């Protein structure tokens, strides 16, 4: 049964005017910016940008790549499913 989200999940995530995304749910550095509550700190794979988003735009990885793991003609998104692929937990600093 599925737990709430943490650092290190596997995500495609949604943001308005963008296709379903790779991403993770990201840990917050000691002495970092937090985020507001009921967010999350979302990397996105490819663009390496972090927006905060809530439960309802997190879609499990696995379960959900056989719809939204395709290639798309946005900016960074192929890089995007390269890593979330092949390197997800790596340093993209």
């Known amino acids: 049964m599925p737990h709430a989200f ?10 308005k ?4 995304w790779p991403a993770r749910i990201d840990d917050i550095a000691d002495g ?12 996105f794979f490819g663009t390496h940008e972090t927006a905060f988003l809530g439960p309802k735009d997190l879609f499990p990885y696995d379960k959900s790549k056989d719809k939204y793991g395709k290639p798309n003609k946005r900016k ?6 390269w890593e979330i692929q ?3 937990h790596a340093s993209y600093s």
Request: hydrophobic residues 30%.
């Open 6 to 15: 943490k650092p290190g999940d596997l995500v495609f995530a949604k943001m």
């Open 17 to 20: 005017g963008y296709p379903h």
């Open 32 to 43: 970092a910016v937090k985020p507001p509550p009921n967010k999350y700190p979302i990397f």
């Open 76 to 81: 960074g998104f192929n890089e995007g499913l």
């Open 86 to 88: 092949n390197n997800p």
